[PDB]
């Protein structure tokens, strides 16, 4: 317990961003103890890939990059290597060689309301798919042929939609907060 990584500042953040404008916090110089989080009843998704799946119950010194965002329940499966879809393509992309953990949990109680929480957004149109860990927070009208235009107009679109999160809909349309952990091993020797 010599300087464990303060994960609670990430997972218990009062406000989470929209998946198109996903945010990263780096937690520096601490022993990743994500094994304590796996133990929790708290998480509906918990998938570690590569070396994070082998060192899952291990304790080691690293920098942790935490990517936070909200998605629909049906969209949570897109936060995985090799996946395609509007979130995977145009919002948040993991590399095929991803070696970290994906954590998600149902946030119906805080991210949905009786009349619909519409504060969270995703992008549905883009010219090309995102590279892994690329981020696009632009709001420029989209057209198939890439010529400038103002909506409303034939073949001219605004690229952002809202999630509509209600307390009446099933888990698939309910809100999920998602945290992606990337671990960066700290080396000792001098430069």
């Amino acid at each position: 317990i010599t300087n464990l990584c303060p994960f609670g500042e990430v997972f218990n953040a009062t406000k989470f961003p929209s998946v198109y404008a996903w945010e990263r916090k780096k937690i520096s110089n601490c022993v990743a103890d994500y094994s304590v989080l796996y133990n929790s009843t708290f998480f509906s998704t918990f998938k570690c890939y590569g070396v994070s799946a082998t060192k899952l119950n291990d304790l080691c010194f690293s920098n942790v990059y935490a990517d936070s965002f909200v998605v629909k329940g049906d969209d949570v499966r897109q936060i995985a290597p090799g996946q395609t879809g509007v979130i995977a393509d145009y919002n948040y992309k993991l590399p095929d060689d991803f070696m970290g953990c994906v954590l998600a949990w149902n946030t119906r109680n805080i991210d949905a309301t009786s009349t619909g929480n519409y504060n969270y957004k995703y992008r549905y149109l883009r010219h090309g798919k995102l590279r892994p860990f690329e981020r696009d927070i632009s709001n420029v009208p989209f057209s198939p042929d890439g010529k400038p235009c103002t909506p409303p107009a034939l073949n001219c679109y605004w690229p952002l939609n809202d999630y509509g999160f209600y307390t009446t809909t099933g888990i698939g349309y309910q809100p999920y907060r998602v945290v992606v952990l990337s671990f960066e091993l700290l080396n000792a020797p001098a430069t």
Partner: single-chain antibody
Amino acid sequence: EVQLVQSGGGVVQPGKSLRLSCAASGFAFSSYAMHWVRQAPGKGLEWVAVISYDGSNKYYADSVKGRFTISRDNSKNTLYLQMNSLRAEDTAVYYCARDRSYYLDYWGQGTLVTVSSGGSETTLTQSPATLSLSPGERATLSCRASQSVRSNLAWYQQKPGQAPRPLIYDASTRATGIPDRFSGSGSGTDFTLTISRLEPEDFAVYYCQQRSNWPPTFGQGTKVEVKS
């Protein structure tokens, strides 16, 4: 294929009661919210009520609040509406509809309810009222909302006397099965639906709907009719 078969229409007198049924098949009924929407004779669609997937949450338009009770039986895959103390204002074709987070992606056939013997909502303004075109021509329909709905607009196609059918969700995304000659555009208050290369089956009434500002509302429609 998702199927919703309604029953229990008929004519009643004012102050009387009726129950509408909607039997669901071809999907996991218990996972979806279910809505009631109604259409008064020769007019636009109005949102009535919604029940949650598990039947514990229920919400009603102000107009029918306190005398319409929505319910469901998840073993029977059936949705109900108990319509008590009916007025002339309630005369409508009633529709059950599967929830797509307050867009409506599958609709029952409709049941007419005639109550006749006595006896800050977001407004969606569609223009023109009618649009008279020939096959192969381009229809451009407009829907100006009173307040911003961002991109939270859907469009529906209604053939005469038949249930509405979703065309577009979220301003610009087509519903399943909808060919690419239909296209929608806009965010905020100014929205268009373009039907290019009009086909014989495209002649119908078209309804825009907002879901984000409570309660869900529909425009009064644009009739795309064959040019006489």
